[PDB]
Amino acid sequence: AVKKFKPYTPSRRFMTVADFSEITKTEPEKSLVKPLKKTGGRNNQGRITVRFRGGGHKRLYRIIDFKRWDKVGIPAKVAAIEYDPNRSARIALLHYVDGEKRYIIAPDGLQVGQQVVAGPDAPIQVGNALPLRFIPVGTVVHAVELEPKKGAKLARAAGTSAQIQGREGDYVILRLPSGELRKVHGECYATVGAVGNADHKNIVLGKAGRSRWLGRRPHVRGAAMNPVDHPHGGGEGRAPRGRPPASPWGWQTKGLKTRKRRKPSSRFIIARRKK
Amino acid sequence: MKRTWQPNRRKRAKTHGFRARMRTPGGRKVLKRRRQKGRWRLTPAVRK
RNA sequence: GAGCUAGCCCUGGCCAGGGUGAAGCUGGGGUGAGACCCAGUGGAGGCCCGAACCGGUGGGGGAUGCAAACCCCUCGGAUGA
RNA sequence: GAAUGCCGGCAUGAGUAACGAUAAAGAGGGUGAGAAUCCCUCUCGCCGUAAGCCCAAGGGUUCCUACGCAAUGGUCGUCAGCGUAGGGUUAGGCGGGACCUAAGGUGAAGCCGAAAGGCGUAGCCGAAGGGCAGCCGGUUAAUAUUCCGGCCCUUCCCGCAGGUGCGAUGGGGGGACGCUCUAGGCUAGGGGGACCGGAGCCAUGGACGAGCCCGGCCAGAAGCGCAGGGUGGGAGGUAGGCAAAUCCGCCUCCCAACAAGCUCUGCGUGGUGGGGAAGCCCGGGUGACAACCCCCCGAAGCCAGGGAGCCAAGAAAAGCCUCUAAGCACAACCUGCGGGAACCCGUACCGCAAACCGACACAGGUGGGCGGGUGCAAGAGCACUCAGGCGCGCGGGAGAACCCUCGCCAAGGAACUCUGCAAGUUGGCCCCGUAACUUCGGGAGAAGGGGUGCUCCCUGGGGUGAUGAGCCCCGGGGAGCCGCAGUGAACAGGCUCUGGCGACUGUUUACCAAAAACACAGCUCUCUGCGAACUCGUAAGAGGAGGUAUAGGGAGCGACGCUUGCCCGGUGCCGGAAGGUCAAGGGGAGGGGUGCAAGCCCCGAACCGAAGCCCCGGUGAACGGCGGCCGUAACUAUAACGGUCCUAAGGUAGCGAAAUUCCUUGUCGGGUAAGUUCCGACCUGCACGAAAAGCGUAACGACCGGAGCGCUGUCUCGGCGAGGGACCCGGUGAAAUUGAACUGGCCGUGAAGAUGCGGCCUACCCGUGGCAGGACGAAAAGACCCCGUGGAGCUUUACUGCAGCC
RNA sequence: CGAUGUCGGCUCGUCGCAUCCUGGGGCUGAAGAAGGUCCCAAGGGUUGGGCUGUUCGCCCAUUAAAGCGGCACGCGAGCUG
RNA sequence: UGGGAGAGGGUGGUGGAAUUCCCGGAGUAGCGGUGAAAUGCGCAGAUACCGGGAGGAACGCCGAUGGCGAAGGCAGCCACCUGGUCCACCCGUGACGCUGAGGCGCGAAAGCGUGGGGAGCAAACCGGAUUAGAUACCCGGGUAGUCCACGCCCUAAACG
RNA sequence: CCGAGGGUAGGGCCCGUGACUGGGGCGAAGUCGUAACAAGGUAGCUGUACCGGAAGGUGCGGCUGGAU
Numbered sequence A: 001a002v003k004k005f006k007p008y009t010p011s012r013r014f015m016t017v018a019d020f021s022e023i024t025k026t027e028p029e030k031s032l033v034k035p036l037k038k039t040g041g042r043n044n045q046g047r048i049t050v051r052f053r054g055g056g057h058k059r060l061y062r063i064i065d066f067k068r069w070d071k072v073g074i075p076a077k078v079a080a081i082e083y084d085p086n087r088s089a090r091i092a093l094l095h096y097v098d099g100e101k102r103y104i105i106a107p108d109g110l111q112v113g114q115q116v117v118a119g120p121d122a123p124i125q126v127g128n129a130l131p132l133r134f135i136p137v138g139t140v141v142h143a144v145e146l147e148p149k150k151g152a153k154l155a156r157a158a159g160t161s162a163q164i165q166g167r168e169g170d171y172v173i174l175r176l177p178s179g180e181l182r183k184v185h186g187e188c189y190a191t192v193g194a195v196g197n198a199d200h201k202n203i204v205l206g207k208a209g210r211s212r213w214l215g216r217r218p219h220v221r222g223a224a225m226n227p228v229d230h231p232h233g234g235g236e237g238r239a240p241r242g243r244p245p246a247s248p249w250g251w252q253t254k255g256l257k258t259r260k261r262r263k264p265s266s267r268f269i270i271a272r273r274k275k
Numbered sequence B: 001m002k003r004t005w006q007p008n009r010r011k012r013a014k015t016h017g018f019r020a021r022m023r024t025p026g027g028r029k030v031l032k033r034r035r036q037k038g039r040w041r042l043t044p045a046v047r048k
Numbered sequence C: 001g002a003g004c005u006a007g008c009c010c011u012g013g014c015c016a017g018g019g020u021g022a023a024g025c026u027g028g029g030g031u032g033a034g035a036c037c038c039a040g041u042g043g044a045g046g047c048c049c050g051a052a053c054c055g056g057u058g059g060g061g062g063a064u065g066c067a068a069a070c071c072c073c074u075c076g077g078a079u080g081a
Numbered sequence D: 001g002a003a004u005g006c007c008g009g010c011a012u013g014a015g016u017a018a019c020g021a022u023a024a025a026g027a028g029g030g031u032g033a034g035a036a037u038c039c040c041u042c043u044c045g046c047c048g049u050a051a052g053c054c055c056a057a058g059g060g061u062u063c064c065u066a067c068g069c070a071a072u073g074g075u076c077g078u079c080a081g082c083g084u085a086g087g088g089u090u091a092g093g094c095g096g097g098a099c100c101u102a103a104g105g106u107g108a109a110g111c112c113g114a115a116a117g118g119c120g121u122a123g124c125c126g127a128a129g130g131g132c133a134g135c136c137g138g139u140u141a142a143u144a145u146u147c148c149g150g151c152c153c154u155u156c157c158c159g160c161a162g163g164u165g166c167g168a169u170g171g172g173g174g175g176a177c178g179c180u181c182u183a184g185g186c187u188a189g190g191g192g193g194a195c196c197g198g199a200g201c202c203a204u205g206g207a208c209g210a211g212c213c214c215g216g217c218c219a220g221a222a223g224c225g226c227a228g229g230g231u232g233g234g235a236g237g238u239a240g241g242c243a244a245a246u247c248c249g250c251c252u253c254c255c256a257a258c259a260a261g262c263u264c265u266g267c268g269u270g271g272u273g274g275g276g277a278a279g280c281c282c283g284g285g286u287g288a289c290a291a292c293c294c295c296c297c298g299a300a301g302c303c304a305g306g307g308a309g310c311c312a313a314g315a316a317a318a319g320c321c322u323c324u325a326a327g328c329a330c331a332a333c334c335u336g337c338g339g340g341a342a343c344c345c346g347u348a349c350c351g352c353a354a355a356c357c358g359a360c361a362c363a364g365g366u367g368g369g370c371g372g373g374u375g376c377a378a379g380a381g382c383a384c385u386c387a388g389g390c391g392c393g394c395g396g397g398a399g400a401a402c403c404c405u406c407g408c409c410a411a412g413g414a415a416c417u418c419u420g421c422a423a424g425u426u427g428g429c430c431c432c433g434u435a436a437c438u439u440c441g442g443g444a445g446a447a448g449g450g451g452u453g454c455u456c457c458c459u460g461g462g463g464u465g466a467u468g469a470g471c472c473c474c475g476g477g478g479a480g481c482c483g484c485a486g487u488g489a490a491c492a493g494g495c496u497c498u499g500g501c502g503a504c505u506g507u508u509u510a511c512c513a514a515a516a517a518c519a520c521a522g523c524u525c526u527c528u529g530c531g532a533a534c535u536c537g538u539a540a541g542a543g544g545a546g547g548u549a550u551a552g553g554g555a556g557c558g559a560c561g562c563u564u565g566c567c568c569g570g571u572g573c574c575g576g577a578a579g580g581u582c583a584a585g586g587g588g589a590g591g592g593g594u595g596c597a598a599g600c601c602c603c604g605a606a607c608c609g610a611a612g613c614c615c616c617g618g619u620g621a622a623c624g625g626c627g628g629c630c631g632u633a634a635c636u637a638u639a640a641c642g643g644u645c646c647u648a649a650g651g652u653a654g655c656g657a658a659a660u661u662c663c664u665u666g667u668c669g670g671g672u673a674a675g676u677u678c679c680g681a682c683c684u685g686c687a688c689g690a691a692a693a694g695c696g697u698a699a700c701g702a703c704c705g706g707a708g709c710g711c712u713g714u715c716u717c718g719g720c721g722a723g724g725g726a727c728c729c730g731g732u733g734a735a736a737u738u739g740a741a742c743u744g745g746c747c748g749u750g751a752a753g754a755u756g757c758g759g760c761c762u763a764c765c766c767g768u769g770g771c772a773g774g775a776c777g778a779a780a781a782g783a784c785c786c787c788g789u790g791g792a793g794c795u796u797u798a799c800u801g802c803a804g805c806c
Numbered sequence E: 001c002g003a004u005g006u007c008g009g010c011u012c013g014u015c016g017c018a019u020c021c022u023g024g025g026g027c028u029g030a031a032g033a034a035g036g037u038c039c040c041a042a043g044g045g046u047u048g049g050g051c052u053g054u055u056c057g058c059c060c061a062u063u064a065a066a067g068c069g070g071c072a073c074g075c076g077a078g079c080u081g
Numbered sequence F: 001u002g003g004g005a006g007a008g009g010g011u012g013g014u015g016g017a018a019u020u021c022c023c024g025g026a027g028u029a030g031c032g033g034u035g036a037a038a039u040g041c042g043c044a045g046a047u048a049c050c051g052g053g054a055g056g057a058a059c060g061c062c063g064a065u066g067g068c069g070a071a072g073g074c075a076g077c078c079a080c081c082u083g084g085u086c087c088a089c090c091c092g093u094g095a096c097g098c099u100g101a102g103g104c105g106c107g108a109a110a111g112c113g114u115g116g117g118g119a120g121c122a123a124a125c126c127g128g129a130u131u132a133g134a135u136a137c138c139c140g141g142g143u144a145g146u147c148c149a150c151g152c153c154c155u156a157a158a159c160g
Numbered sequence G: 001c002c003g004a005g006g007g008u009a010g011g012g013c014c015c016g017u018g019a020c021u022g023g024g025g026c027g028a029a030g031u032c033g034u035a036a037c038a039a040g041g042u043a044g045c046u047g048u049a050c051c052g053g054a055a056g057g058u059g060c061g062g063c064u065g066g067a068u
Ligand SMILES: CC(C)C[C@@H]1CCO[C@@H]2[C@H](CN[C@@H]2C(=O)N[C@H]2[C@H]3O[C@H](SCC/C=C\[C@H]2C)[C@H](O)[C@@H](O)[C@H]3O)C1
Pocket: E003, E005, E006
């Protein structure tokens, strides 16, 4: 339920903000935070390697449990649902009966006070983690490991999910959030349900300063530059591309496929994304 | 207006100082050159 | 060589006073329940006026200068990108 | 003898410009060889959110005192930030170190690179962040939280006593955090007092007074008081916090729970120690046994790690507390008390500036704190003033032109001009009132108008106190008084109508462009399944991202509204197991050299043999492109209609003489007395047109047009006045430039524009103030233009390579 | 070409005459008045405004008239730009 | 009070047939389409056949001249929530009724906004035929839309 | 004091008029096609949507005021 504003400034006209209605705890778990080292897009050489980064709000990193096969069989209670600024999904604070406390990304519909559990025997309930092989065909699923014991890699952003399509030997077939059809090994863990905060996509930033808050520095069109800078630079007055549209580095940017040809994972992708 | 020389003792020592020169192939050649030429000062003097 | 300048990182600091009066909340009206209307409260905003501060719009002066970019009058921003 | 040659010396311009903010000076007295310029006194003016005071940087003896004036000081100099000498900086508590970690840096392990080197977890370094114990006064020519005085405090060592399972680099807690708004109680600071203390004063018409003028505090341990912060207590279970754990976490039960209790800060009080004005008299002494009290205002500071709301979700590590591990429990640790111990470096001075950065004693630049009073609605704004600090290191006259900054102006009022450029006007607050249009916020300070001082009388509410007085903050009603004028000075919008562009706030060519340019939310296309794509790197390694398709990269478009048509033949990109071509390599029909020969050696056809290219399809918010001629209607004209050629397809909607229209000031209409601009139309659009988007759009704009009202020295058309210069006298004294000069006019001549040649004319010698026609005047080896088989940036289906990718 | 600053305006003029007006004339298809045309004449005079950067030109209102040219398309060490 | 019939409405679930596409197998010279054709598709292996998978939309027979609703309109099956309505009994209230300017709600299709979804169909559009032309009728393609959620639009031969 | 009215400024309603533009009515013998009435040669009509020289065409859903 995105929230609107009255047009009492030019920007409040279109600005929308998340409702935060699912949130129940508004300061993080001190034992589970560490500082997030802002990079500005600069690598260890000091060089910009991702342009237009820097200047956003300060953040603490919340440690997230992307394994969950860490504590097979041990139930936990959902203590709180919190805001995480490092990701689009909300996060859920888990109180294990162990006394251990851990964060997971919060699936759609997960309720404070309910229990979750991980393992081959866990019930098929929103919030439970099982190896893919034991989850019924057709189940909607998130936080999917891509290789066993390597950690949840797929379907982690707000609103996304994967659907289990069928089995073939030691692999299950998944429809990824991109629509790709992929074989993922059956021992890979996954969590029942879709990721929450599905309204995330409908937020309207509203003003230029909002992008600045997020660490997004202004993006400069190539057509605005000079030939020293960009294939689209130069020209008296405005100019069309006047060549196939290109990146600052000269490679084409409308169509040119870029996935490496002889990649081994090609044997495991059934059908490229559509739409 | 604001001119270009804005002195700073720590900056001066960290940038041109003896230890900065020794840590680097090029800096050691500077000291070698300034010794061969007979410079009274191999490095800028800052109060430190 | 980034003690000038450009960007970013870490850690600190600064922004007189006045104006406008969003959401929400409360109450009253309204209805089958509502939406919603009114009042009070409230104090939002790349909101308004204006110092510090940051600028540099127009004109005049200066032009072997007070100054290798300054001075006067005027003018933009001033809780924010 | 020339090279705009090189180095040096010395000329010219010239006693010329200038002497660095227009805050401003005058006199008396001293000193001295010498005084506008040094010292003292009186008078005058300037700053006073500073032009005063305190920190930090940077500077480095510039500080204080004596003796000096050659040079430095834009003049002078007896003076000085100058010369010579002597002196001067005192810490367990202030700052930094013997503490901590941040980015970053460095780097056992390890990784990579021809060499040099590059990376890299821990660890270490790294501060203006965390942590940590000193306040007030006195003293020196010059230091003081440092010396001294008074009262306080910290750590380390040893000892005594009491207590306890003691013990850590290990576990845990805490430290520990945003932005805006903000409560209670205080403090700093300030105002008033008919109260308290004080040297005096009565002037010039009046006043001996509830008169004037001055001051009326500061620090403080325990205790106490007020206000706040922090914190649940007990028991049982326990598999988690990489060993252990009685701690922490999780579950359960009991009690306490707007509390309490314990603990910690702030403020008040507090033994005690200090301070203590005007005036007078020589920094000092007195005043003085100084008094040291009541009322009000009141922080942005303090209690604080306080409260609330919001989204963009807000360091680490140590100190500290707790837990236990080896170990040790004759130890150790905790508490109290006592004695001892407590190192290194900084400390002078300048510090919005004559001591820092600008070559200068340079109108520029330089971060943090304090920054008093009155009035103006408020305030750090404005005027004037306190404390304090200054009059800006050339002066004296004069009272021309002209220049600068400033004031006024009859009648007119934009007639000025590219343009109302500039300058007027308007101007704060309170009340009345306010249009099209609109995205319902706005447009809006729309416009336009009325009020505004002082006096007396009456009176409403808020704060303090007591519910009153008093004080204080907002008012309200009536009646009056004065002036040309009441925000009486200073600070403080001119307004409207209508177009173009860009939605908007923002950003930019440091130093000729601030814009219509860039950015911007938003829209679309495209790549990317994660050891992602992409980027930097030879690599290792990084960024992407401790992210995962609601995400990340690239590209265009640019809020929003209504929309975005047709063409895939060419280029691009995407798909295509066929076919064609295709390199190394495979294959070896068949030849050749040599040898007596076995052999050795060489050439080599068919055929098999990737990517790429060809070929077949797809694809426009991919690169791009979107016709010609002729005919036709019962007035004419014009063609809804037709014919034919061509194309991949022949420009749709909307718009149109436009930021685009050549002809062009198109034509018509509006506005004006008059309109190449403007606005509204028309459409034969030289040469609009749909994301290099098309057409609109409220609001916004130091953008660019056009009009009107208001008002003006812009102008008719100039006048007067002020100050700083210009001018004259005293002091100091540049500059570009310069073949040399004894350097006139005309008409001719001359390399074609003559002071210099010819002829004539004119003209005694030398200056000073002015003006700019000439000396093809000066600063600059033309930047336009060409030339050079000169250079450099940029482009591409120029050539040829290379990275990269296949 | 080791620089002869370039359009328009402003200011300041000065000159030529192929004369726009004013003065003197001859001819007229000159009744008068008013014109036309040519001759002599450079003494003086030759307006304000709208448009446009404009020179020019068009237009408004006047006038005796609203002259045309030269002076580096006069004049930027005089201004504008 | 006791019963009833019903595609009345809303939410969730779920079943088979068919179409399309994808994969595997088998197989070869055409398939498709019409009045006839052509475009199209097919030796790069189509059509026709078998097995597997994916996905959306509509529910054959029953089915009627049927039923339900105020209308618009409603059809596989299942559960839940819910409206109307009729019959019986003759038990309760005691005229508590009829209509209804305004108001409010509902309102097929198409259309609009924001997300999703997209098999079939199909405005626009392209192509092939026809024709004097053919911006049509017929044929091959084909985008909105048709579907879901929420919010609008409020029309109709909304008719008996 | 009130006060006819005058002045200044800003709104509301109405009438007249305007380059040009939109369709409408009408007009003895104009041009283009033939949409409708017969199954009008594609049954017609319909609300809406999109397109086209024009009548119209097509999509979706509706009506019979449709024939056989
Ligand atoms: C049509 C036109 C293109 C012809 C052309 C006009 C331009 O110039 C003129 C050329 C002829 N030579 C002239 C010239 O060089 N003039 C110089 C000036 O430079 C500045 S004046 C400001 C700059 C102006 C002009 C510069 C080019 C100095 O002061 C002057 O002394 C002078 O050197 C012709």
